[PDB]
Coordinates of C-alpha atoms in Angstrom, one line a residue:
Chain A
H8 CA -55.9 -34.8 -34.5
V9 CA -53.1 -34.5 -31.8
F10 CA -50.4 -32.3 -32.7
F11 CA -47.2 -33.2 -31.3
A12 CA -43.6 -31.8 -31.6
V13 CA -40.4 -32.6 -29.9
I14 CA -37.6 -30.5 -29.0
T15 CA -34.9 -32.7 -30.1
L16 CA -31.8 -32.5 -31.2
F17 CA -31.9 -36.1 -33.1
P18 CA -35.3 -35.3 -35.1
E19 CA -34.8 -38.7 -36.9
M20 CA -34.8 -41.5 -33.4
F21 CA -38.6 -40.6 -32.8
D22 CA -39.3 -42.9 -36.4
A23 CA -38.7 -45.1 -34.3
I24 CA -42.3 -45.1 -33.2
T25 CA -44.0 -42.8 -36.0
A26 CA -42.7 -45.8 -39.1
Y27 CA -43.5 -49.2 -36.9
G28 CA -46.1 -50.5 -34.7
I29 CA -49.7 -49.1 -33.3
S30 CA -48.1 -45.7 -33.2
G31 CA -47.0 -45.4 -36.4
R32 CA -50.4 -46.4 -38.0
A33 CA -52.2 -43.6 -36.5
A34 CA -48.8 -41.0 -37.8
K35 CA -50.2 -42.4 -41.2
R36 CA -54.2 -41.9 -41.1
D37 CA -53.1 -39.2 -39.6
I38 CA -55.3 -40.0 -36.7
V39 CA -51.3 -38.5 -34.5
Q40 CA -48.7 -35.4 -36.4
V41 CA -45.7 -35.7 -35.1
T42 CA -43.8 -32.0 -35.4
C43 CA -39.6 -32.5 -35.3
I44 CA -38.4 -29.5 -34.0
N45 CA -33.8 -28.8 -33.7
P46 CA -33.5 -26.5 -32.0
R47 CA -29.7 -25.2 -33.6
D48 CA -32.3 -24.6 -36.5
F49 CA -32.1 -22.0 -33.8
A50 CA -28.6 -21.0 -33.1
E51 CA -25.9 -19.0 -34.4
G52 CA -22.8 -20.2 -35.3
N53 CA -21.4 -22.4 -38.3
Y54 CA -21.3 -25.1 -35.8
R55 CA -25.3 -24.0 -34.6
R56 CA -24.4 -24.5 -30.3
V57 CA -26.9 -24.9 -28.2
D58 CA -24.5 -25.6 -25.8
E59 CA -22.1 -24.0 -23.1
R60 CA -19.7 -24.3 -20.7
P61 CA -21.6 -24.1 -16.8
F62 CA -21.1 -20.8 -14.8
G63 CA -19.7 -22.4 -10.8
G64 CA -17.7 -24.6 -12.7
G65 CA -18.5 -28.1 -12.4
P66 CA -18.3 -31.1 -16.1
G67 CA -20.6 -30.4 -19.2
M68 CA -22.5 -29.0 -21.0
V69 CA -25.4 -26.7 -19.9
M70 CA -28.0 -26.3 -22.9
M71 CA -28.3 -22.7 -23.6
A72 CA -32.3 -20.9 -23.5
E73 CA -31.5 -18.6 -26.4
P74 CA -32.4 -21.8 -29.0
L75 CA -35.4 -23.6 -26.7
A76 CA -36.3 -20.4 -26.9
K77 CA -37.3 -19.3 -30.3
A78 CA -37.2 -23.4 -30.6
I79 CA -40.2 -23.7 -27.9
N80 CA -42.3 -19.8 -29.4
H81 CA -41.0 -22.0 -33.1
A82 CA -43.5 -25.2 -31.9
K83 CA -46.1 -23.3 -30.3
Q84 CA -46.8 -21.1 -33.7
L85 CA -47.4 -24.4 -35.7
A86 CA -49.2 -25.2 -33.3
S87 CA -52.1 -22.6 -33.2
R88 CA -51.5 -22.7 -36.8
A89 CA -52.9 -26.5 -37.6
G90 CA -56.2 -25.2 -35.3
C91 CA -55.1 -25.7 -32.1
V92 CA -56.3 -24.3 -28.7
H93 CA -53.9 -24.8 -26.4
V94 CA -50.4 -27.7 -26.4
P95 CA -48.8 -27.1 -23.3
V96 CA -45.2 -27.7 -22.9
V97 CA -43.6 -30.6 -21.8
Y98 CA -40.4 -30.9 -20.2
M99 CA -39.4 -34.8 -19.6
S100 CA -36.1 -35.4 -16.8
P101 CA -36.3 -37.6 -13.6
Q102 CA -37.1 -34.2 -11.1
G103 CA -39.9 -34.4 -12.5
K104 CA -43.8 -35.6 -12.0
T105 CA -43.6 -39.2 -11.9
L106 CA -46.1 -40.1 -14.8
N107 CA -48.0 -43.0 -14.3
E108 CA -51.5 -44.3 -16.0
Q109 CA -53.2 -41.6 -14.0
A110 CA -51.0 -38.8 -15.6
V111 CA -51.3 -39.9 -19.1
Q112 CA -55.2 -40.2 -18.9
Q113 CA -55.1 -36.0 -18.3
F114 CA -53.4 -36.9 -21.6
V115 CA -56.0 -37.7 -23.4
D116 CA -58.6 -34.8 -23.2
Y117 CA -55.8 -32.4 -24.6
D118 CA -55.2 -31.1 -28.2
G119 CA -51.4 -31.6 -28.4
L120 CA -48.4 -31.5 -26.7
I121 CA -45.1 -30.0 -27.5
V122 CA -42.2 -32.1 -25.6
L123 CA -38.9 -30.7 -24.9
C124 CA -35.3 -33.2 -25.3
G125 CA -32.9 -32.3 -23.6
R126 CA -29.1 -33.5 -23.9
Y127 CA -25.8 -32.7 -22.7
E128 CA -25.6 -31.9 -18.2
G129 CA -28.5 -29.8 -17.8
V130 CA -30.7 -26.7 -19.3
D131 CA -30.4 -23.2 -18.5
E132 CA -33.6 -23.5 -15.7
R133 CA -33.8 -19.6 -16.2
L134 CA -35.2 -21.8 -19.4
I135 CA -37.5 -24.7 -18.0
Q136 CA -38.4 -21.3 -15.5
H137 CA -40.4 -19.3 -18.3
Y138 CA -41.3 -22.0 -21.1
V139 CA -42.5 -24.4 -19.1
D140 CA -45.9 -25.5 -17.9
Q141 CA -45.3 -28.8 -16.8
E142 CA -42.1 -31.8 -15.7
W143 CA -42.6 -35.5 -16.4
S144 CA -40.1 -38.4 -14.7
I145 CA -40.6 -41.4 -16.3
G146 CA -38.5 -43.2 -14.1
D147 CA -35.9 -42.3 -11.2
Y148 CA -33.1 -43.4 -13.7
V149 CA -30.3 -41.9 -15.5
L150 CA -30.7 -40.8 -19.7
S151 CA -28.1 -39.9 -22.1
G152 CA -31.5 -37.3 -23.7
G153 CA -34.7 -36.9 -23.5
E154 CA -35.9 -38.2 -26.4
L155 CA -37.2 -41.5 -25.1
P156 CA -38.9 -40.2 -22.0
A157 CA -41.5 -38.6 -24.5
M158 CA -40.9 -41.2 -27.2
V159 CA -42.7 -42.8 -24.0
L160 CA -44.9 -40.3 -23.5
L161 CA -46.3 -40.5 -26.6
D162 CA -46.8 -43.1 -27.4
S163 CA -48.3 -44.3 -24.2
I164 CA -51.5 -41.6 -25.5
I165 CA -50.8 -41.6 -29.3
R166 CA -52.3 -45.6 -27.7
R167 CA -55.1 -44.9 -25.4
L168 CA -56.4 -42.2 -28.4
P169 CA -59.7 -43.1 -30.3
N170 CA -59.7 -44.5 -33.4
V171 CA -55.8 -45.8 -32.0
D185 CA -58.6 -51.7 -12.1
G186 CA -55.7 -51.8 -10.4
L187 CA -54.2 -55.2 -10.4
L188 CA -51.4 -57.1 -12.3
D189 CA -52.6 -59.2 -15.0
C190 CA -52.6 -63.1 -15.1
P191 CA -50.7 -65.2 -16.5
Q192 CA -51.6 -66.2 -19.8
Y193 CA -50.9 -69.6 -22.0
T194 CA -51.7 -69.7 -25.7
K195 CA -50.7 -73.0 -28.4
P196 CA -49.0 -76.2 -27.4
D197 CA -51.1 -77.9 -25.1
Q198 CA -47.6 -78.7 -23.3
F199 CA -44.3 -76.9 -24.2
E200 CA -41.3 -78.6 -22.7
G201 CA -43.3 -80.7 -20.6
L202 CA -45.4 -77.7 -18.8
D203 CA -49.7 -78.2 -19.3
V204 CA -51.9 -75.5 -19.7
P205 CA -53.9 -75.4 -16.1
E206 CA -57.6 -77.4 -16.8
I207 CA -59.3 -75.2 -15.0
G211 CA -63.4 -75.6 -18.8
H212 CA -66.5 -73.1 -17.8
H213 CA -66.9 -69.2 -18.5
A214 CA -67.6 -68.4 -14.9
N215 CA -65.3 -70.5 -13.8
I216 CA -62.9 -69.3 -15.3
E217 CA -63.0 -66.4 -14.4
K218 CA -63.0 -66.4 -10.9
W219 CA -59.7 -68.5 -11.8
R220 CA -58.1 -65.2 -13.6
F221 CA -60.0 -63.6 -11.1
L222 CA -57.6 -65.2 -8.2
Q223 CA -54.9 -65.9 -10.2
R224 CA -54.1 -62.0 -10.6
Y225 CA -55.2 -60.5 -6.9
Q226 CA -52.7 -63.2 -5.6
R227 CA -50.1 -61.7 -8.2
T228 CA -50.8 -58.1 -6.8
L229 CA -50.6 -59.5 -3.4
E230 CA -47.2 -61.7 -3.8
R231 CA -44.9 -59.1 -6.1
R232 CA -47.0 -54.4 -5.2
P233 CA -48.7 -55.2 -2.2
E234 CA -49.3 -52.2 -1.3
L235 CA -51.7 -51.9 -4.2
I236 CA -54.6 -53.7 -3.2
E237 CA -55.3 -51.4 -0.7
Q238 CA -55.8 -48.9 -3.6
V239 CA -58.0 -51.6 -5.5
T240 CA -61.5 -51.4 -5.6
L241 CA -63.9 -54.5 -6.2
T242 CA -67.1 -55.0 -7.5
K243 CA -69.7 -57.9 -5.7
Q244 CA -69.2 -60.9 -7.7
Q245 CA -65.2 -60.4 -6.8
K246 CA -65.8 -60.2 -3.1
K247 CA -67.6 -62.6 -3.3
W248 CA -65.4 -64.9 -5.0
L249 CA -62.4 -64.0 -2.8
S250 CA -63.7 -64.3 0.4
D251 CA -65.2 -67.6 -1.1
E252 CA -62.0 -68.6 -1.0
Chain B
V9 CA -20.0 -55.6 -24.5
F10 CA -23.0 -58.4 -26.2
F11 CA -26.9 -56.6 -26.2
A12 CA -29.2 -59.1 -28.4
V13 CA -33.1 -57.3 -28.6
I14 CA -35.7 -59.9 -29.6
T15 CA -38.6 -57.5 -31.2
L16 CA -40.4 -57.4 -33.4
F17 CA -39.7 -54.3 -34.0
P18 CA -36.1 -53.9 -35.0
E19 CA -35.8 -50.7 -36.9
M20 CA -36.7 -49.3 -33.5
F21 CA -33.5 -50.0 -32.2
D22 CA -32.0 -47.3 -34.5
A23 CA -33.0 -44.8 -31.9
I24 CA -30.7 -45.8 -30.0
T25 CA -27.3 -47.8 -32.6
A26 CA -27.2 -44.8 -34.3
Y27 CA -27.6 -41.4 -32.5
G28 CA -26.5 -40.0 -29.4
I29 CA -23.5 -41.4 -26.9
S30 CA -25.0 -44.5 -27.6
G31 CA -24.1 -44.3 -31.3
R32 CA -21.7 -42.7 -30.9
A33 CA -20.4 -46.2 -28.3
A34 CA -22.2 -48.2 -31.2
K35 CA -20.0 -46.9 -34.4
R36 CA -16.3 -46.9 -31.8
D37 CA -17.9 -50.9 -32.1
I38 CA -17.7 -50.5 -27.8
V39 CA -20.8 -52.2 -27.5
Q40 CA -22.9 -54.0 -30.0
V41 CA -26.4 -54.9 -30.1
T42 CA -28.3 -57.1 -32.6
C43 CA -31.6 -57.3 -33.7
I44 CA -33.8 -61.1 -33.3
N45 CA -37.2 -61.1 -34.8
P46 CA -39.1 -63.7 -33.7
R47 CA -40.5 -64.3 -36.9
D48 CA -37.6 -65.9 -38.4
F49 CA -38.2 -69.1 -36.4
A50 CA -42.0 -69.8 -37.1
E51 CA -43.1 -72.2 -39.1
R55 CA -45.1 -67.1 -39.9
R56 CA -47.3 -66.3 -36.7
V57 CA -45.9 -65.5 -34.0
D58 CA -49.5 -64.5 -31.9
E59 CA -52.2 -66.9 -30.9
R60 CA -56.2 -66.9 -28.9
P61 CA -55.6 -67.5 -25.4
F62 CA -56.3 -71.5 -23.3
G63 CA -58.4 -70.2 -21.2
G64 CA -60.7 -68.1 -23.4
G65 CA -60.9 -64.4 -23.6
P66 CA -59.8 -61.6 -25.9
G67 CA -56.6 -60.8 -27.0
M68 CA -53.4 -62.1 -28.3
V69 CA -50.4 -64.6 -26.5
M70 CA -46.6 -65.2 -27.8
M71 CA -46.6 -68.1 -28.3
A72 CA -43.5 -70.3 -26.8
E73 CA -41.9 -71.5 -29.7
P74 CA -41.6 -69.1 -31.7
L75 CA -39.5 -67.8 -28.8
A76 CA -37.8 -70.0 -27.5
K77 CA -36.4 -70.4 -30.7
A78 CA -35.2 -67.0 -31.3
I79 CA -33.7 -66.1 -27.2
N80 CA -31.6 -69.8 -28.4
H81 CA -30.9 -68.4 -31.1
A82 CA -29.3 -65.6 -29.3
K83 CA -27.3 -67.2 -25.7
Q84 CA -25.7 -69.3 -28.6
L85 CA -24.5 -65.8 -30.0
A86 CA -23.8 -64.4 -27.1
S87 CA -21.7 -67.4 -26.3
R88 CA -19.8 -67.2 -29.7
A89 CA -18.6 -63.6 -29.1
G90 CA -17.2 -65.2 -25.2
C91 CA -20.1 -63.8 -22.2
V92 CA -19.4 -65.8 -20.2
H93 CA -23.1 -64.7 -17.9
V94 CA -26.0 -63.5 -19.8
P95 CA -28.8 -63.0 -18.0
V96 CA -32.2 -62.7 -20.4
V97 CA -34.2 -59.8 -19.3
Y98 CA -37.9 -59.3 -19.8
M99 CA -39.1 -56.1 -20.3
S100 CA -43.1 -56.2 -19.0
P101 CA -44.9 -53.4 -16.7
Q102 CA -45.3 -56.7 -14.0
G103 CA -41.6 -56.1 -12.9
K104 CA -39.4 -55.5 -10.6
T105 CA -39.4 -51.0 -11.2
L106 CA -36.0 -49.9 -12.6
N107 CA -33.9 -47.6 -10.6
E108 CA -30.2 -46.5 -11.1
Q109 CA -29.2 -49.4 -8.8
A110 CA -30.8 -51.8 -10.5
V111 CA -29.2 -50.0 -14.0
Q112 CA -25.7 -50.2 -11.4
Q113 CA -26.0 -53.7 -11.8
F114 CA -26.0 -55.2 -14.5
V115 CA -22.7 -53.3 -15.0
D116 CA -21.2 -56.9 -13.9
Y117 CA -22.3 -58.5 -17.0
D118 CA -20.5 -60.1 -19.6
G119 CA -24.3 -59.2 -21.6
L120 CA -28.1 -59.1 -22.2
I121 CA -31.1 -61.1 -24.0
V122 CA -33.7 -58.3 -24.5
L123 CA -37.6 -59.7 -24.7
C124 CA -39.6 -56.9 -25.8
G125 CA -42.7 -58.8 -25.7
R126 CA -45.9 -57.0 -29.0
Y127 CA -49.9 -57.7 -28.4
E128 CA -51.7 -58.5 -24.8
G129 CA -49.6 -60.9 -23.6
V130 CA -46.2 -64.0 -23.1
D131 CA -47.3 -68.0 -22.6
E132 CA -46.4 -67.8 -19.1
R133 CA -44.4 -71.2 -19.5
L134 CA -42.1 -69.3 -22.1
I135 CA -41.2 -66.9 -18.9
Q136 CA -40.9 -69.1 -16.4
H137 CA -38.5 -70.9 -18.1
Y138 CA -36.2 -68.9 -20.8
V139 CA -37.0 -65.4 -19.0
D140 CA -34.1 -64.7 -15.3
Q141 CA -35.3 -61.3 -14.8
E142 CA -37.9 -59.0 -15.0
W143 CA -38.0 -54.9 -14.7
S144 CA -41.5 -52.8 -15.4
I145 CA -39.2 -49.1 -16.2
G146 CA -42.9 -47.1 -14.8
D147 CA -46.8 -47.7 -13.6
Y148 CA -48.0 -47.2 -17.6
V149 CA -49.1 -48.9 -20.5
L150 CA -47.7 -48.9 -23.6
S151 CA -47.8 -50.5 -26.9
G152 CA -44.7 -52.7 -26.5
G153 CA -41.3 -53.9 -25.2
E154 CA -39.3 -52.1 -27.3
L155 CA -38.5 -48.8 -25.7
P156 CA -38.5 -50.2 -22.0
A157 CA -35.5 -52.4 -23.7
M158 CA -34.3 -49.2 -25.2
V159 CA -34.5 -47.4 -22.3
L160 CA -32.8 -50.3 -19.7
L161 CA -30.0 -50.6 -22.4
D162 CA -29.6 -46.2 -22.9
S163 CA -29.1 -46.5 -19.3
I164 CA -26.4 -49.0 -18.7
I165 CA -24.4 -48.1 -21.8
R166 CA -23.6 -45.1 -21.5
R167 CA -22.8 -45.6 -17.6
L168 CA -20.1 -47.5 -19.3
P169 CA -16.5 -46.8 -19.7
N170 CA -14.0 -45.7 -21.8
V171 CA -17.9 -44.3 -22.3
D185 CA -26.5 -40.6 -3.8
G186 CA -29.5 -39.6 -4.0
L187 CA -30.9 -35.3 -4.6
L188 CA -32.3 -34.0 -7.1
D189 CA -29.9 -32.4 -9.7
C190 CA -29.3 -28.5 -8.7
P191 CA -30.4 -25.7 -11.4
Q192 CA -27.2 -25.2 -14.1
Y193 CA -26.8 -22.2 -15.7
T194 CA -24.8 -20.7 -19.1
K195 CA -25.0 -17.5 -20.7
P196 CA -27.1 -14.8 -21.2
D197 CA -25.8 -13.0 -17.7
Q198 CA -29.7 -11.9 -17.9
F199 CA -32.9 -14.0 -20.5
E200 CA -35.6 -11.9 -20.6
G201 CA -35.0 -10.6 -17.1
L202 CA -33.6 -13.1 -14.7
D203 CA -30.1 -13.4 -13.5
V204 CA -27.7 -15.6 -12.7
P205 CA -27.1 -16.3 -9.0
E206 CA -23.7 -14.4 -7.6
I207 CA -22.4 -17.2 -6.4
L208 CA -22.3 -18.5 -9.2
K209 CA -21.4 -16.3 -12.1
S210 CA -18.0 -15.6 -9.5
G211 CA -18.1 -18.0 -6.0
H212 CA -15.2 -20.3 -5.4
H213 CA -14.6 -23.6 -5.2
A214 CA -16.3 -24.1 -1.3
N215 CA -18.8 -21.7 -1.3
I216 CA -20.5 -22.7 -4.1
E217 CA -20.1 -26.7 -3.6
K218 CA -22.5 -25.6 -0.1
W219 CA -25.1 -23.3 -2.2
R220 CA -24.9 -26.7 -5.0
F221 CA -25.5 -29.5 -2.3
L222 CA -28.3 -26.5 -0.2
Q223 CA -30.0 -26.5 -3.5
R224 CA -30.3 -30.3 -4.1
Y225 CA -31.6 -30.9 -1.0
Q226 CA -33.8 -28.3 -0.9
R227 CA -34.7 -29.1 -3.8
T228 CA -35.6 -32.7 -3.4
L229 CA -37.3 -31.5 0.1
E230 CA -39.8 -30.1 -2.3
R231 CA -40.6 -31.9 -5.2
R232 CA -39.2 -35.6 -3.8
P233 CA -39.3 -36.1 0.3
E234 CA -39.6 -40.2 -0.1
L235 CA -35.8 -39.1 -0.8
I236 CA -34.1 -37.5 1.4
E237 CA -35.3 -41.0 4.6
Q238 CA -32.6 -42.5 1.8
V239 CA -29.3 -40.1 1.6
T240 CA -27.4 -40.5 4.0
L241 CA -25.0 -37.0 4.1
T242 CA -21.8 -36.4 5.3
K243 CA -20.3 -34.3 8.1
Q244 CA -20.0 -31.7 6.0
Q245 CA -23.4 -32.4 3.9
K246 CA -25.2 -32.3 7.4
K247 CA -22.9 -28.8 8.5
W248 CA -24.9 -27.1 6.2
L249 CA -27.6 -28.2 6.7
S250 CA -27.3 -27.6 10.3
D251 CA -25.8 -23.7 9.2
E252 CA -29.4 -22.9 7.4
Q253 CA -31.7 -24.2 9.3

């Protein structure tokens, strides 16, 4: 029962992953659990403010440390009460390490995560220093908030959970036999098809991501296929 | 600005149309997002086994072609001059901030969200103008990348340098023993802008040193660096 707690101002956004698709199915089956924590519940004031003007000037608002600290502490206690051994706090920001497939595989071994979704134009650095264990970026583009990266991370993990090579995929075809004048390649036999599929993958990787060829490990059979062509 | 997404899960797109800054833009009709389910254009399966054999299912071209064409007629009826059809897949060029700025020059987008284990190559050949990947990780579907693309564009629309951002601070003055840097607390225009720039440069150097090679510094910033180095 992998445990997920997200610190977000918009908990309902996570219906996009908890109510649909393969991730929704895992939540409905309780293979995973997603609990959203609104930092406003830990804010002071009739407007439950979590943002304040930046020290040193400049535009925008910064997320206050105190509401985020109380919310993450609440998340940690929920995780302990759920029977988790340890749950790291992940902060999604463009300043994090680059998420990739190798990084996602490491998360599968976890009991769960606390994912902190920032809003406004920053999060108080002292909160990051004291409460964040890991910082991850899904890409070098700027988004309005951390919710979508959080969902990307969660979807990428849940997708790999039980009960739920470095080359690019090759082109794929399905019915009809002819579409708008374009036919399926005639290539059939099982052996000769797998050879064709591999040669298509290598070239596609070669044409589009040639830096990945340096880091691919080919079987003895695949090495022979390359030399034969 | 016109946005059309081809998705089996239209409801997922509530995360951008109903919350946050993008939701505010949608409520104010600064943008419009229309979801098109390919299931409505089947005569109602949308997936079938691959021609060459092997595991998985491929999204059929004919339902997607009717849906993409239906999307095209909706965009023309809205008066858009040029609307590229973008396909979100891990085999695409990597989205970044430079690419997102390039989208602003468009009248609108048709974004194609794949599911299952592929899309028929002939549909891509005939209907897709651009193919973009948000990262080198595997997700259960194209919806989350589509929302990532939509959010980063909508955020930059009117009426809505290569270094990492520098740290940010707000009240209280001291949090869990950590103080706000005095330069932010009591500094002026010049000495703060110098501090923020040196923080950005160092943070980029420590965390993303490959980005230093592609930054072009003003004479003012070059002087700030040499005064420290």
